[PDB]
Design a binder for these strands. Sequence first.
DNA 1: TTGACTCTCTTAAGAGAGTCA
DNA 2: TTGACTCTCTTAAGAGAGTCA
Lengths: 162, 162
Amino acid sequence: ALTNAQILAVIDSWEETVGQFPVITHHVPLGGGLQGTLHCYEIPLAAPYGVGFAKNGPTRWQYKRTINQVVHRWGSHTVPFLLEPDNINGKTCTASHLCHNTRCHNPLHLCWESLDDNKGRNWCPGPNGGCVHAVVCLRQGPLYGPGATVAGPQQRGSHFVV
Amino acid sequence: ALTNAQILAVIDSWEETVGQFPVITHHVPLGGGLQGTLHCYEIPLAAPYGVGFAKNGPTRWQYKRTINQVVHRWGSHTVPFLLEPDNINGKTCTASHLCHNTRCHNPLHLCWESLDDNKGRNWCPGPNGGCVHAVVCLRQGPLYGPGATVAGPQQRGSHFVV
DNA sequence: TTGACTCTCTTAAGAGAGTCA
DNA sequence: TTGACTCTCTTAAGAGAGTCA
Ligand SMILES: [Mg+2]
Ligand SMILES: [Mg+2]
Ligand SMILES: [Zn+2]
Ligand SMILES: [Zn+2]
Ligand SMILES: [Zn+2]
Ligand SMILES: [Zn+2]
């Protein structure tokens, strides 16, 4: 809600509830042929999810609290960042999973960045493979690799140069 | 159905027409602090665009030919790949700009790959910076770099471990 | 047959808000 | 007040199809 105290109270209540989610150990590529372990705090697959939580999409949830007798609601991963600017260079800030695990609500696996920065982590070589993200990746992106391109650049005649 | 010969004729007329688009010289990062040059064949900003071409969106065009009284139409960047498979690993193939210049129709700047592979090139370090794409990038992706993350992983209490 | 417009759709990383009990 | 559902939206890489003369 409006006051800093009320916002801290929201974050604290969210942390307490999420802190009781099941802790799931995930072994992940780090890049450079190395592997690490992440501890994700995973929201349940079906109701009940936890106090204040409700599912608005297949992998979308919202956190809800009643403050000043009114309902205040946020995207479930946005709550750690309620005291942060909501935009950067005119682009909306988004909650961004460093563990690439949407059910995870561990705030140590979340950052707050443009949707472009968010997406780009999917292809990052990872913290041991050359990640240059200023807020460092926790793992190699799930889509990192050579790709599966069907056809490369080509011409039939002689009209073009690279 | 169009025969192989008719499809080749479509590709050839498309190449003829695109080859008359203005050729614009761009200096681009290759990764590793090196600079290179790309020569883009850029569709005009406004009508007329060239024989067979029409704009269906701000940065979307289509190519149209009428063959034996039947109107055929294709996405304007898909024509080089009409003799290729249209899907791979269960995913639709998409025209993918290696030059990241949507107006460019240079087929030496295009490849044919999944939308995920396509998107991921935006963050690639480039052919001189560590590109691992099997069909190699022509330049460092425009979004490569440290990013502009507003807030990193953080907790107010002690409920979580990474 | 052709040009120049019009409209909506897909994907996978993210969102806001309403209807009931 | 709290829970459990419903709906559509945003973005930036890509698409398909209709109307009229
Ligand atoms: Mg993400
Ligand atoms: Mg692209
Ligand atoms: Zn996690
Ligand atoms: Zn990274
Ligand atoms: Zn180009
Ligand atoms: Zn690459």
